């Protein structure tokens, strides 16, 4: 959703690519009101690839983060973090009922 | 509003009173922001620096809720996706 | 830009009001008093120097 990126003009193939690959996770649970992404470029002089993202939640939020050479490998990391996140968050939880007295 | 009563830039006036006697000219590059209507500015056709460049108009009788401060809405198509 | 805005403000005008009074020391134009002609943060910057009363702090 909210995407501001400094020192670069965004394009559209990255949009369908990244946001569709994020859409794959409605296995659990999406729940897709906000998804704030964040970037920047930063001379080292090897000189950057910032890949930072929020993926906020019902009653809570989150953070995944990464820096890379390149946006494809560097992105497969904003995903394959959130996956494991959402998964756990659902496991959880506590049902093993048990009468009382 | 105005405080009794209408005003004008007066350096344009020095132009119209000059071109007012003969067969009146109809070509003007000008500035025309703080200059409101009155019927000595007729016989003459106005192209006002719109914000980028000058832009003509045939002056015409019905010009009562109108003035030359601008008649080209300068937001320039539009700024908007839809039309009016 | 900045350096020549400094000269823009203090040279003459056409009439009364197309003119500003920013801060002397810093060039901070906005949110600045006319009492001392001193911006938001120049006074703090020179409040701690304690030249003037001045108080600092917390009774109101």
């Amino acid at each position: 959703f909210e995407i501001h990126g400094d020192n670069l003009t965004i394009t559209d193939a990255i949009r369908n690519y990244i946001e569709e690959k994020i859409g794959k996770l409605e296995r659990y649970f999406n729940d897709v009101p906000n998804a704030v992404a964040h970037v920047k470029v930063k001379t080292y002089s090897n000189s950057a690839t910032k890949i930072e993202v929020t993926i906020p939640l019902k009653n809570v939020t989150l953070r995944a983060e990464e820096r890379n050479d390149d946006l494809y490998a560097g992105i497969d990391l904003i995903n394959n973090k959130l996956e494991r996140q959402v998964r756990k968050y659902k496991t959880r939880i506590n049902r093993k009922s048990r009468d009382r007295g | 509003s105005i405080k009794k009563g209408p005003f004008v830039d007066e350096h344009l006036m020095k132009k119209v009173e000059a071109q007012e006697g003969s067969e009146k000219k109809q070509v003007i590059k000008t500035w025309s922001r703080r200059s409101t209507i009155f019927p000595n500015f007729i016989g003459h056709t106005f192209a006002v620096y719109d914000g980028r460049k000058h832009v003509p108009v045939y002056v015409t009788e019905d010009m009562v809720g109108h003035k030359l401060g601008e008649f080209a809405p300068t937001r320039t198509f539009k700024g908007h996706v839809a039309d009016d | 830009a900045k350096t020549s805005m400094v000269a823009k403000q203090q040279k003459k005008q056409k009439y009364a009001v197309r003119e500003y009074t920013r801060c002397e020391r810093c060039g901070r134009p906005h949110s600045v008093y006319r009492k001392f002609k001193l911006c938001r943060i120049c006074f703090r910057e020179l409040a701690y120097k304690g030249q003037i009363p001045g108080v600092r702090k917390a009774s109101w």
Partner: protein, 99 residues
């Protein structure tokens, strides 16, 4: 029907000690002095922000004291005239002579 003055100091004792030493000068050659009548000492404020760019909510307050201090004396002689205009220090006061 007597001398009356107004003193404004930004340290809250000089009003009192200056008032009393000039009173001493005033009753030296004279008498009939009304005292340092207090006035409410109105204030000021400056709502300054603890920032440079943003974070407008984190701010703070400088202020000011503006005291007025009303002192008189009756039945002049030109030596208590000099009691006014003999000693003025500390001159942070806004001393104003009247009658």
């Amino acid at each position: 029907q007597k001398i009356r003055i107004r003193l404004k100091a930004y340290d809250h004792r000089v009003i009192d000690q200056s008032a009393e030493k000039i009173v001493e000068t005033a009753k030296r050659s004279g008498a009939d002095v009304s005292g340092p009548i207090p006035l409410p000492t109105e204030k000021s404020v400056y709502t300054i922000i603890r920032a440079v760019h943003m974070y407008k909510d984190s701010r703070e307050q400088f202020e000011q004291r503006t005291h007025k201090r009303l002192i008189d004396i009756v039945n002049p002689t030109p030596k208590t005239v000099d009691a006014l205009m003999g000693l003025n220090l500390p001159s942070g006061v806004d001393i104003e002579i009247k009658l």
